[PDB]
Amino acid sequence: TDFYTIKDAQADLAIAPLNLTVLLAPYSTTPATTLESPTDGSLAIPPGYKSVGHFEKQAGLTLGNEFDSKDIEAYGEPEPIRTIINKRTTTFDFAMYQN
């Protein structure tokens, strides 16, 4: 098998978030299970979610994933036999313009 066939890379699977928006809702609002409209598969935002408007372009939106890990090493092994991801913290930050 040739290298290109082994790679089987698709450019269409690369998705560029050309226009991004952030919507916030009070904790009493029913959470959004999905954003796909059941009737026609369009973009359906549940009621109670309100956009934060424009935000900075150069800053963008940064999604941060932080892993807390623990190394399990055995008495009869030099390297750690296993690693445990105790927790995974998710954060996101951005710079809103509107008041």
Binding site: Y75, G76, E77, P78
Partner: protein, 290 residues
């Protein structure tokens, strides 16, 4: 370094060079930070006095040497062989020799395992095949020794007398040992060398003690060492019983020495006297002092 060479002779006769030229040839090297190795531990006594406390004498303590070694090889099987051999070189009941050789000669210390060794790292030692062993050895006799000096005087005359040259080049007093053949009446020196430990330092400058008359076959070992009984008959006779509250009391003080006189009388077949003088030092190496 080539100025200092540390070796161990195990209880089984194995020879290890832990430091100096040839170190690690047997697979075991010596780690730094070894304690109570150089100076003999001595504690001083103090009694209350007008200006605080007054000096009351000193007592020497047994050595507690805590050191560490590396047992190393490229393959785990041979490392295991070396580690087993190192463990075999030690015991609690019987002692192994630890020699330090420098420009001041070779001096040895007899040491035994004070407690069980602490080997290996936190993981299994076959991974690294290069592991430390923590040794807590003890020296019951805390003084570094050299080979004792032995002198022989044999005679065929019934009455004879000789002068044994004796000298204490060490920094600590030593106790003399005599081996006297039988029969015959022996007179042995017990010179104080100025020692006032019995308030007779100069009264006993030329003190001689006459051992009891020995019957045939009653060869005696006369050791002034406080550890052992002074008179020991080889045949089990109570020779000390016929000795009337007399004893060898004085060691050979440091820096002192002379031609001590040994006299033999009433010996039909002559007699032989052997003098053993130990060479005890408080340090593995030290320049001669006088």
């Amino acid at each position: 370094t080539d100025f200092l060479k540390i070796e161990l002779i195990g209880r089984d006769g194995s020879h290890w060079v832990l430091s100096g030229p040839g170190m690690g040839q047997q697979g075991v090297t010596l780690n730094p930070n070894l304690q109570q190795f150089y100076d003999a531990p001595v504690k001083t006594l103090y009694v209350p006095g007008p200006f605080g406390e007054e000096y009351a004498g000193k007592r020497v303590q047994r050595r507690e040497i805590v050191f560490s070694v590396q047992a190393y090889d490229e393959d785990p099987d041979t490392w295991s062989t070396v580690d087993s051999l190192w463990r075999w070189a030690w015991d609690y009941d019987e002692e192994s020799e630890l020699r330090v050789s420098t420009s001041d000669g070779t001096r040895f210390l007899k040491v035994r395992l004070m407690e069980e060794p602490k080997p290996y790292y936190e993981k299994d030692p076959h991974i690294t095949a290069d592991n430390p062993i923590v040794m807590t050895v003890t020296a019951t006799f805390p003084y570094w020794q050299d080979e004792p000096e032995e002198l022989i005087w044999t005679t065929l005359s019934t009455e004879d007398m000789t002068r044994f040259p004796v000298r204490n080049d060490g920094d600590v007093p030593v106790w003399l040992k005599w081996t006297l053949t039988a029969p015959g009446l022996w007179i042995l020196p017990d010179f104080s060398w100025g020692n006032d430990m019995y308030s007779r330092g100069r009264e006993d400058l030329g003190r001689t003690v006459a051992m009891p008359e020995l019957v045939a076959g009653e060869h005696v070992s006369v050791d002034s060492d406080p550890r052992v009984q002074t008179l020991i008959a080889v045949n089990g006779m109570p020779t000390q019983n016929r000795w009337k509250g007399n004893d060898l009391l004085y060691p050979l003080m440091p820096g002192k020495g002379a031609e001590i006189p040994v006299q033999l009388k009433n010996a039909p077949e002559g007699g032989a006297c052997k003098l053993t003088r130990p060479r005890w030092y408080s340090r593995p190496w030290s320049r001669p002092g006088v």
